[PDB]
Subunit: 114 residues, 3 copies
């Protein structure tokens, strides 16, 4: 039961680390937090409201996992000299697909609002 | 691969079992409630997302442990970043269930 | 705007790599355009059309993050000469749950529409 408070602190510590270190996290988080607020104040149904929010929050989840992968690569880079960067490319690709998805979700749903 | 990973996640990780139960409860409750298709999908997939992220989080932790059990700044950062992603998935899941059930 | 062009180039470098390296991604890539076409060809509402696409997109995202983890393990595997499959299994386990989710989504939604 106390493992929750322990894991909560780690999560909060990871959020700060993401925010402090990753620049892509800060900019995306801004556009994400903006989108979340708008979705909370639109004239739409629950299914649409959720779809707008979740597609946007997915960008943050992927970006957080991308940063974790990059931190792993950096850990390797401190002990090893050659870095292909292939792992960071795949992580950057994953964030792109998540963003494109969020763009599509919003365009499609708002085209019903119109 | 796939099943070997699900078997290892269920046996060793405890939070994964609390999501596995939650997934079944999600599916059960989503089907027992008189809701539309999109709502039922949203209740299920939002919970399964938490599991998906949890699996990826555990995978990242495994790599870190393999690099070494040695305490480094980037080793703990990677684990905290992974742990943070699982949080957002849960937050997303909680928000999802709220909006859908509030409208009921 | 200079960072964006570089980040996108990384993402494209990551996608171009995933397409050539893994055949699983090629399959999922085909499925996406197929899902988009099927979602648009069918006369369905916006909420469902989004879920039909987002579910398949999620698989491609999880695959990319998995391939990123697989790449890190290989960089390590070359240095350590060890092959512990904890990471690779958990990564593929994640993709499995994603695919299962995509099937449930397509079932529940299309079962309702027809
Ligand atoms: N090698 C390391 N270097 C630095 N910090 C580390 C570390 N290993 C663990 N930590 C720190 O301790 C915390 C707990 O480690 P870890 O996140 O792997 O536990 P966990 O709660 O996920 C247990 P389980 O593997 O059963 O799920 C991490 O979030 C991190 O803050
Ligand atoms: C059809 C009209 C309405 C369209 C509605 C679309 C909504 C998209 C939702 C979320 C954005 C997710 C990605 C956020 C990316 C943030 C980073 C960014 O764009 O940064 C630019 C910056 O200038 C670089 O320095
Ligand atoms: C209506 C509500 C609007 C709310 C505000 C929304 C603003 C942002 C929207 C679209 C820009 C999308 C730009 C996408 C650029 C992707 C670049 C890329 O590849 O990024 C990889 C990433 O940096 C690896 O970490
Ligand atoms: Zn763990
Ligand atoms: Zn952890």
């Amino acid at each position: 039961f106390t493992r929750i408070i322990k894991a909560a602190g780690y999560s909060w510590k990871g959020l700060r680390a993401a925010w402090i270190n990753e620049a892509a996290f800060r900019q995306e988080g801004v556009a994400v937090l903006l989108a979340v607020v708008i979705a909370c104040w639109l004239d739409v149904d629950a299914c649409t409201r959720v779809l707008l929010i979740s597609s946007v929050m997915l960008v943050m989840i992927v970006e957080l996992l991308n940063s974790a992968i990059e931190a792993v690569v950096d850990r390797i880079g401190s002990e090893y000299h050659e870095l292909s960067g292939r792992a960071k490319d795949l992580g950057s690709a994953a964030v792109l697909i998540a963003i494109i998805d969020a763009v599509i979700t919003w365009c499609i749903l708002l085209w019903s609002h119109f």
